[PDB]
Amino acid sequence: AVDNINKTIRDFETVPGVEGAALVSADGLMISSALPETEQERVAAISAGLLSLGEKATTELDRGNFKEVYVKGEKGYTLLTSVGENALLLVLAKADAQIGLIFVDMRRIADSLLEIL
Amino acid sequence: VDNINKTIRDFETVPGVEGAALVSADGLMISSALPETEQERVAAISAGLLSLGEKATTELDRGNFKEVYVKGEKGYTLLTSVGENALLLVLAKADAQIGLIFVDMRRIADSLLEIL
């Protein structure tokens, strides 16, 4: 269960444009990452912050149970998909990444990690 | 002011578009066709989506805020910057084509910026 989760998350970083991928709990704690060892505690805290305010969007405007959220800035994308209850998958990319298809890969791998986790 | 209004009734025609609104960055509604009871509330909710969208785009070094996407199982909330001091919110159905509606918003967001 643990060998197969680590390798699945790092393989995202073999797509053109993808910098990092972290599997984080809903409550802000790091499960499995390949990001720099320094930033791993502060990125897991921000991830859970983005999950909670995506929840607000969907509840408050009558849109159904939360699925996905992405933010585009000047320099790059932040991309987040729910892993059933209690977990979530983060991808960072730059402006030249092919966002619609990463969400299709993210959706399939979420349900894969959901069985073995 | 007549050329800002019906310009927001026209997105509804496109398939998958439940509702549009022009809102201020402080949370006061400018132009919308939504139920005239909800409009004050919906102006408040789009307020936070921008700020809490500016907080990921300032904490993870992604540059200036441009756009925010959320998706729920019964549909989508989309928001784009209408320059400084306003924003365009679009409620869509969970079977609409997002990549095009963004192409239609980001142009209109710079065709309302010069007359507003």
Author numbering:
A (entry chain A): 4 to 120
B (entry chain D): 5 to 120
From the article:
The proteins (Thor-RB and MKD1-RB) were purified, crystallized and their structures were elucidated via X-ray crystallography to 2.14 and 2.69 Å, respectively. Both proteins are homodimers formed from protomers comprised of 5-stranded β-sheets sandwiched between a single α-helix (formed between strands 2 and 3) and a pair of α-helices (formed from the N- and C-termini). We compared the structural similarities of Thor-RB and MKD1-RB with MglBs and eukaryotic RB proteins. Both proteins displayed approximately similar levels of homology with the RB proteins M. xanthus MglB and H. Sapiens LAMTOR2, matching ~110 residues with an RMSD of 1.5–1.6 Å. Lower levels of homology were seen in comparison with longin domains (86–94 residues, RMSD of 2.5-3.0 Å) and profilins (96–102 residues, RMSD of 1.7–2.7 Å). These homologies indicate that the RB fold is highly conserved between all domains of life and that the profilin and longin domains share a core structure with RB. Despite the similarity in structures, Thor-RB and MKD1-RB display different surface charge distributions. Thus, we hypothesize that MKD1-RB may be a membrane-interacting module, whereas Thor-RB, which lacks the basic patch, may be a scaffold protein for protein:protein interactions. The Odin-RBLC7 structure shares a similar homodimeric structure to Thor-RB and MKD1-RB but lacks the terminal pair of α-helices observed in the RB structures.
